């Protein structure tokens, strides 16, 4: 039971550290920012089964 209260109330409790492509202090990019960005934008909304 993933009660997604964050998406409901709009709060951001831990989605800021889930990925290294998110906003980071002083805009320090992750070592694989480009690859993760491509993977996330490719697999956005199509579902996990298709994304695999």
């Amino acid at each position: 039971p993933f009660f997604d209260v964050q998406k409901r109330l709009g709060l951001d409790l831990d989605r800021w550290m889930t990925i290294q492509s998110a906003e980071q202090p002083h805009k320090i990019p992750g070592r694989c920012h480009a690859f993760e960005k491509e993977w996330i934008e490719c697999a956005h909304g199509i579902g996990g089964i298709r994304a695999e």
């Binding site: 002083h26 990019p29 996330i40 956005h44 199509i46 579902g47 089964i49």
Partner: protein, 63 residues
């Protein structure tokens, strides 16, 4: 009552139950196909939201 009342009631019941059986088989096939392909509104396991990605000038030019 008349013998035709039970006749028509039986016809209606048979129609309803046959529709139920056909719908159950259809639902099983639909669920199997959706789970196998993941191209429908069901079995849509979540992925990373692309709104978290920061499209701002980073520190290193090669991003």
């Amino acid at each position: 009552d008349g013998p035709e009342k039970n006749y028509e009631k039986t016809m209606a019941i048979l129609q309803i139950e046959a529709e139920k059986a056909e719908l159950r088989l259809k639902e099983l096939e639909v669920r199997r196909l959706m789970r196998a392909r993941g191209d429908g509104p069901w079995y849509q396991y979540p992925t990373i939201d692309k709104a978290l990605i920061d499209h701002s000038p980073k520190t290193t030019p090669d991003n």
